[PDB]
Amino acid sequence: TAPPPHVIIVPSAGMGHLIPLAEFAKRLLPRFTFTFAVPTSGPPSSSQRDFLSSLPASIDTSFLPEVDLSDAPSDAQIETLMSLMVVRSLPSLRDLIASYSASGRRVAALVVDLFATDAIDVALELGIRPFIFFPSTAMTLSFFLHLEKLDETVSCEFAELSDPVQIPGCIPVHGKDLIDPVQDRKNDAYKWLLHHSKRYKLAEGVIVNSFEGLEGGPIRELLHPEPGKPRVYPVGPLIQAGSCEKGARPECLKWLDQQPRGSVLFVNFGSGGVLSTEQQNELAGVLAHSQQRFLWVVRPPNDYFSVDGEIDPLKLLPEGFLEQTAGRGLVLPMWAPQIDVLSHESTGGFLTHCGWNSTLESVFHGVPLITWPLYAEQKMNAVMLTEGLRVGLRPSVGKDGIIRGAEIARVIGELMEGEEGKRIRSKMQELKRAASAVLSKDGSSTRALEEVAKIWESK
Template sequence: MLLSLFLSLPDLDARTAGEFRDLPGPVQLPGCVPLLGADLVDPCQDRSDEAYAWLLRQASSYPLAEAIFVNSFEAMEGATFTALAGGPPVHAVGPLVQSPEPRACTATAWLDGQPPGSVLFASFGSGGTLSLAQLTELALGLEASGQRFLWVVRRPSEDRADAAFFSVVDAENPVGFLPEGFLERTRGRGLVLPSWAPQARVLSHAATGGFMTHCGWNSVLESVVNGVPMIAWPLYAEQRMNARLLAEGVGVALRATPEENGLVGRVQVARLVRTLMAREEGSRLRQRVRRLQLEAARGLAEGGASHVALAKVVAGWKGSCQELRVSYCPITSRRVENYI
């Protein structure tokens, strides 16, 4: 989806007056679900900013590429790849994700004691942060849901949703910002970890049955590869676009929606968690994401679509290496021939 935006942005810029976020109708990118202007990547939210000018310059150079690699796969974004067929060759070679290390840790040791598919993993990526008010609403919503959860908590920030990228870890324990009595009331069915958890290991664990995520692309792919349905809670960058794809395009996520006060309230949090983990709609999402999981595995296997796409490119590189370079080893004086 993001590539579709970049390839379309020069034309979209030329025919749009004002800010994208103020458009009365949807933005229709080739091969993608309809988006709101407010869903577009952060630099598109202020066209007078230098960040937008830089993005537009970069996007204008994309059609000059000889080929573009995308960490995605046909079963997830096939319509988009089809729509982009008239431009530079696009090679879908994913989903390429980090393999979890088998080492034990606090998170996996706790998960070992939980029933299969019973735990919601809540994490907002490497940089995602919530305000104190939102942190409180999320905590009380998790408590009210009655579901098991493993939650990575960071120190709240009132300034920006990606604050963890720009701050150092201080001595102040983020757990101290949780509502009074929350840890005691949820003891036994919830585990709170400060700042970090081994996400790939958590998502691959049999006890993990849902993922509340900021919708960063790596996190999305890790969830799909492990067959885990999601609650999409985008914060910044292209995450709103990813959330739209997950909820309305491939149907493997529920979408968290800020209310009039700008917060995702505790009642909505509890409803989303119960729906994903304990209701029929959640079961349907789980079935869809497991079908995607199987398609992802097939695509990466020898002879699969992603494997073939990469092999085709490599074969082309090999075929173009026809110039013979002859040299002599300075030690043995033997002739050395290399194709470059």
């Protein structure tokens, strides 16, 4: 029995990033031990502590001493605050790695999230193999690697372009659908994104949470060796599992058991996927007059109370909405067991914000999508899902930023009924089979994990 090498993980801010990073680590146990070296700007939340403490013993956590970000503009985007958090935590990261190295442990790799490339300098100075973990699409990774060239060939704001932007190996995308932090090139968020994208070549490999069956074009382009381009390791789809391992007995799953097969539309924009009052009313009015069964996770709009103290969103729904939907739809406040809903046989569609974790969970369970992108790279994901793979439908937004009921109803109807919705469903089942094929004991993604593991163990 050999001593397990140690691996340090530097995540970018967000539970959405801890989830796929923990799944990645869990699939390399017990060959290594891990430490989540978590930059902080304040007391770690109870959600972070609870999630990280629930992991296997071989994955430890160190919350780095909090840094001060009050000097940043109050309008600073999240990419800027995330980059500032890492840079200012590097001394603490050095002290953490020193505690392990001083005890005799071999530190075999430093895994940094997509906006934590400034920690790569520490790894290079200490003879530690730097790797980047990319929790988004291969399409978005290609955009990152191409951003330098795009920045030097385009002077105007991207949303002003008439022709769609062409990324090597990707479907074209109009500038207005490019990731949020490139929509204002004067903002620090764009400069930070440019900064990180030029540093991906400093890593010995990029680990991307996707697979070739889902993004053939981008993956095959990325795998093609080129000078100045890092090696890429598709290891997706890395997602959490259902609750059938503890002991369809949750309340909302009992309702799904009664409904017909593949007949329910699941609505969930995820935490932070808040709608305006006007936008939520448009969605509620369509569901109220529809004959479509739905399961809707509702959150208080950004513009009385419940048992714990949070505002009760289902009392903010329009007049007698719960009367018009009593037997056909089910409303849930704040949270729902998403993976258990997507795995349920009664679930036929998923209205999602196109966060990549949620998309991968839907693909793995063969549930076609209504793509309602909100922020980050979600609009790029929507284009790839709907115009590329054709496994979902996208409602068009109006000039005032509101998606009207006529569009919500159009895509719902076309997806759950209509012939195009059947083709979409058929295509999504093909991706479902392809997803479980790359994660098998001898799967394409399981092999990529092996390559990474052996590299970490080499020398």
